Design an enzyme around this catalytic site. Structure first.
Site, PDB file in Angstrom:
ATOM      1  N   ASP A  77     -14.472   8.025  -7.985  1.00 43.20           N
ATOM      2  CA  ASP A  77     -15.376   8.433  -6.915  1.00 43.20           C
ATOM      3  C   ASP A  77     -14.921   9.663  -6.148  1.00 43.20           C
ATOM      4  O   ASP A  77     -15.439   9.967  -5.078  1.00 43.20           O
ATOM      5  CB  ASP A  77     -15.668   7.262  -5.958  1.00 43.20           C
ATOM      6  CG  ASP A  77     -14.474   6.874  -5.092  1.00 43.20           C
ATOM      7  OD1 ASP A  77     -13.309   6.993  -5.531  1.00 43.20           O
ATOM      8  OD2 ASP A  77     -14.718   6.419  -3.959  1.00 43.20           O
ATOM      9  N   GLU A  95       0.789  -1.231   0.000  1.00 42.69           N
ATOM     10  CA  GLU A  95       0.000   0.000   0.000  1.00 42.69           C
ATOM     11  C   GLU A  95       0.821   1.280   0.000  1.00 42.69           C
ATOM     12  O   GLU A  95       0.461   2.219  -0.681  1.00 42.69           O
ATOM     13  CB  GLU A  95      -0.968   0.050   1.190  1.00 42.69           C
ATOM     14  CG  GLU A  95      -2.118  -0.948   1.145  1.00 42.69           C
ATOM     15  CD  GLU A  95      -3.053  -0.772  -0.043  1.00 42.69           C
ATOM     16  OE1 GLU A  95      -2.938   0.204  -0.808  1.00 42.69           O
ATOM     17  OE2 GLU A  95      -3.937  -1.627  -0.212  1.00 42.69           O
ATOM     18  N   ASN A 125      -9.226   4.872   2.756  1.00 43.52           N
ATOM     19  CA  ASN A 125     -10.057   5.694   1.874  1.00 43.52           C
ATOM     20  C   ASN A 125     -10.999   6.708   2.545  1.00 43.52           C
ATOM     21  O   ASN A 125     -11.730   6.375   3.486  1.00 43.52           O
ATOM     22  CB  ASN A 125     -10.842   4.758   0.955  1.00 43.52           C
ATOM     23  CG  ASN A 125     -11.601   5.491  -0.096  1.00 43.52           C
ATOM     24  OD1 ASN A 125     -12.768   5.823   0.089  1.00 43.52           O
ATOM     25  ND2 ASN A 125     -10.951   5.760  -1.218  1.00 43.52           N
ATOM     26  N   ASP A 160      -6.899   8.011  -0.788  1.00 47.16           N
ATOM     27  CA  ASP A 160      -6.457   7.041   0.214  1.00 47.16           C
ATOM     28  C   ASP A 160      -5.294   7.665   0.968  1.00 47.16           C
ATOM     29  O   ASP A 160      -4.385   8.211   0.343  1.00 47.16           O
ATOM     30  CB  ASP A 160      -5.984   5.759  -0.456  1.00 47.16           C
ATOM     31  CG  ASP A 160      -7.062   5.086  -1.230  1.00 47.16           C
ATOM     32  OD1 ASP A 160      -8.191   4.988  -0.720  1.00 47.16           O
ATOM     33  OD2 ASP A 160      -6.782   4.658  -2.364  1.00 47.16           O
ATOM     34  N   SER A 170     -12.447  10.196  -4.307  1.00 41.17           N
ATOM     35  CA  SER A 170     -11.891   9.935  -2.983  1.00 41.17           C
ATOM     36  C   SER A 170     -10.355   9.852  -3.004  1.00 41.17           C
ATOM     37  O   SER A 170      -9.742   9.739  -4.064  1.00 41.17           O
ATOM     38  CB  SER A 170     -12.466   8.639  -2.416  1.00 41.17           C
ATOM     39  OG  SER A 170     -12.134   7.550  -3.248  1.00 41.17           O
ATOM     40  N   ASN A 215      -8.452   9.012  -6.294  1.00 42.17           N
ATOM     41  CA  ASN A 215      -9.257   8.165  -7.170  1.00 42.17           C
ATOM     42  C   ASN A 215     -10.262   9.043  -7.904  1.00 42.17           C
ATOM     43  O   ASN A 215     -11.256   9.469  -7.320  1.00 42.17           O
ATOM     44  CB  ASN A 215     -10.004   7.102  -6.378  1.00 42.17           C
ATOM     45  CG  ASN A 215      -9.082   6.265  -5.527  1.00 42.17           C
ATOM     46  OD1 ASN A 215      -8.358   5.403  -6.031  1.00 42.17           O
ATOM     47  ND2 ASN A 215      -9.090   6.522  -4.220  1.00 42.17           N
TER      48      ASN A 215
END
Length: 130
Positions: free
Chosen positions: A49, A35, A60, A53, A51, A46
């Site tokens: 959507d 990650e 998220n 992370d 969003s 992202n």
């Protein structure tokens, strides 16, 4: 902060992550490796959507933390996303525990399924004495 392998292993352990909800320490380590590479300041936006992370676990903003700029966001962890970009991981660990309390467990993270699930992950903690 970019943790060194065994430094993170030992810390996650004292924070009660080893075996948390059936999830091994080597598994939390594998997730963190893919990650963020152990970097607490990691981020990924992202476009789909809207969003982002945050942190070493890449939590998220749509469901877990509030960053104040994500549509239809929920704050399941009840914390500012900024709290997850800090050197002190107490808050990130607490929010990771909440994520895995849901039915899907650690499978919520795609990287984990693609890179850790059903594979040998012993390398992540060998030599750390944990």
């Amino acid at each position: 902060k970019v943790f060194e392998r065994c430094e993170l292993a030992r810390t996650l352990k004292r924070l009660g992550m080893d075996g948390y909800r059936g999830i091994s320490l080597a598994n939390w380590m594998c997730l963190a490796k893919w990650e963020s590479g152990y970097n607490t300041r990691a981020t990924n936006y992202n476009a789909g959507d809207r969003s982002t992370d945050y942190g070493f676990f890449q939590i998220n903003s749509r469901y877990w933390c509030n960053d104040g700029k994500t549509p239809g966001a929920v704050n399941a962890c009840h914390l500012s996303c900024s709290a997850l970009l800090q050197d002190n991981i107490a808050d990130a660990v607490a929010c990771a525990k909440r994520v895995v309390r849901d039915p899907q467990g650690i499978r919520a993270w795609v990287a984990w399924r693609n890179r850790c699930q059903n594979r040998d992950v012993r390398q992540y903690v060998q030599g750390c004495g944990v």
